[PDB]
């Protein structure tokens, strides 16, 4: 349980590894895995699509049920649902999509949800199709999160850029 191996320390509580977050979740068995969700919890692509596919659509079925009760999430908000076979819990967090004009300030609010959980396996929020600068997103993470965060970054080129920008 929570057997993280091969992570590089960035700060006392933020670690990083060049790895696939789905493969890590299966090896590590974490208490919490974080999903880079959208407000409708439609796990179509990116991290969200990969995590959902690894549950063979169990996560989407549960998410559809939650959205029928609560309506859409808010940007900056989150919900804790089942982790299915990847984790005990999955924390679905909505970061801002700056392509759509959503406020980059809200990325702080997004990361703040991490502080309700003592250890998390997570991706960088608001990267990819959400349009934010990933190095900037890591800055906000290390400024905001006070609990133990293990970040999985798939792209080796981006991984090297991140480790350079933080330790060089």
Swiss-Prot record:
It catalyses: Thiol-dependent hydrolysis of ester, thioester, amide, peptide and isopeptide bonds formed by the C-terminal Gly of ubiquitin (a 76-residue protein attached to proteins as an intracellular targeting signal). It is a multi-pass membrane protein. May form homohexamers. Interacts with N protein. It comes from Severe acute respiratory syndrome coronavirus 2 (2019-nCoV). Responsible for the cleavages located at the N-terminus of the replicase polyprotein. Participates together with nsp4 in the assembly of virally-induced cytoplasmic double-membrane vesicles necessary for viral replication. Antagonizes innate immune induction of type I interferon by blocking the phosphorylation, dimerization and subsequent nuclear translocation of host IRF3. Also prevents host NF-kappa-B signaling. In addition, PL-PRO possesses a deubiquitinating/deISGylating activity and processes both 'Lys-48'- and 'Lys-63'-linked polyubiquitin chains from cellular substrates. Changing residue 31 to A: In strain: Mu/B.1.621. The chain holds residues 1025 to 1192 of 7096 of the full protein. It comes from the Viruses. Signal peptide: none annotated. Inhibited in vitro by GRL-0617. It is found in: Host endoplasmic reticulum membrane. This is Papain-like protease nsp3. Residues 1-168 form the Macro domain.
């Amino acid at each position: 349980v929570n057997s993280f191996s091969g992570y590089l320390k960035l700060t006392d509580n933020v670690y990083i590894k060049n790895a696939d977050i789905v493969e890590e979740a299966k090896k590590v068995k974490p208490t919490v895995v974080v999903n880079a969700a959208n407000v409708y919890l439609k796990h179509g692509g990116g991290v969200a699509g990969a995590l959902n596919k690894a549950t063979n659509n169990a996560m989407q079925v549960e998410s559809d049920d939650y959205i029928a009760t609560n309506g859409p999430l808010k940007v900056g908000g989150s919900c804790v649902l089942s982790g299915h076979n990847l984790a005990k819990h999955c924390l679905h967090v909505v970061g801002p999509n700056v392509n759509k004009g959503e406020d980059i300030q809200l990325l702080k609010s997004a990361y703040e949800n991490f502080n309700q959980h003592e250890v998390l396996l997570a991706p960088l929020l608001s990267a990819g199709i959400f349009g934010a600068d990933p190095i900037h997103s890591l800055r906000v993470c290390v400024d905001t999160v006070r609990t133990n965060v293990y970040l999985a970054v798939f792209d080796k080129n981006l991984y090297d850029k991140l480790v350079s920008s933080f330790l060089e």
